Every structure is written in structure tokens, then in C-alpha cells.
Design a protein around this ligand. Sequence first.
Ligand SMILES: OC[C@H]1O[C@@H](O[C@H]2[C@H](O)[C@@H](O)[C@H](O)O[C@@H]2CO)[C@H](O)[C@@H](O)[C@H]1O
Ligand SMILES: [Cl-]
Length: 138
Amino acid sequence: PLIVPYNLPLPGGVVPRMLITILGTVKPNANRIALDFQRGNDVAFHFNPRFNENNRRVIVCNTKLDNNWGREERQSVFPFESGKPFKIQVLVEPDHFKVAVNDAHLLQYNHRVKKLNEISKLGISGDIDLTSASYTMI
Ligand SMILES: OC[C@H]1O[C@@H](O[C@H]2[C@H](O)[C@@H](O)[C@H](O)O[C@@H]2CO)[C@H](O)[C@@H](O)[C@H]1O
Ligand SMILES: [Cl-]
């Protein structure tokens, strides 16, 4: 019921205790999913499940500054499956984003962009049917 790519504004940026929840279903024969927490043109946190990178499934995380991608942090634990519904929860903590998928902790990503209050948009894209994109304070 939501258009993809989807832009979710994050008013006044992010802050510790902010929980962002994305519900969707992976399409059959999916290639990629991307969450992009943006600070203007910069990407503070790119969370990028890849379903077929040299016949491997991997999650690539990174930051884009001044149009340049930085050093990739790769996670081989891969909780997504083509055709299946998922929940991604991103909890903002003082020193990292903490990601859980389907209620199971997946990874953390240390804050490289430090102006948390300027990370004011989340872009959601890729091979999914998007059901819900929302946030709350815990
Ligand atoms: O780093 C995130 C970024 O990756 C780009 O692709 C990389 C690829 O991961 C790497 O193996 C290769 O050496 O360089 C490519 C270009 O930097 C994606 O194009 C981009 O969308 C992000 O996902
Ligand atoms: Cl910064």
C-alpha cells in the first residue's frame, strides 16, 4: 500500500531512543533492498541487503559523504528471503544504529555522521512490497 521508493521524513533528525520500523515483503527473485538515512545529499547510514553478489547473500552497510562511498561494513548473517514478509527495526542509540530483523538482533553501525539532528530523511528502496514505514520514541 506504499509506493517504492518511499521517502519517510524524520522531523528534526534522529535522536537516541528513536525507533524506525519498516514492514514489507521481499519480492520473488529479489536482487536488493536499501534503507538510506540521509543528511541532505549525504547518506549517514546505508543498509543494503544484496541477494546475489557473486552468488552470495550479504548485507552491505556504508556512509556516503560528498558523493563518495566510504569503507563498507559487511554482515554475512542474512535474515531476508525472497517472497517473505519482514520487519526491520532500526533503533538509534548514542553511538550506533542498532538493527533487528524479525525481532532478532542483526547488526550495529557506529555513527560516522555525527550531526544526528540533521539526518532528516529515510529513503526505502529495492525489490519489496512496502507495507508500513513509521517511527516512535521508546
Ligand atoms: O558501499 C556501498 C555502495 O556500494 C556500491 O557498489 C560498490 C561495491 O559494493 C564494491 O564491491 C565495488 O568495489 O565498488 C562499488 C562502487 O563503489 C553501490 O553501487 C552503491 O549503491 C552502494 O551500495
Ligand atoms: Cl557530521
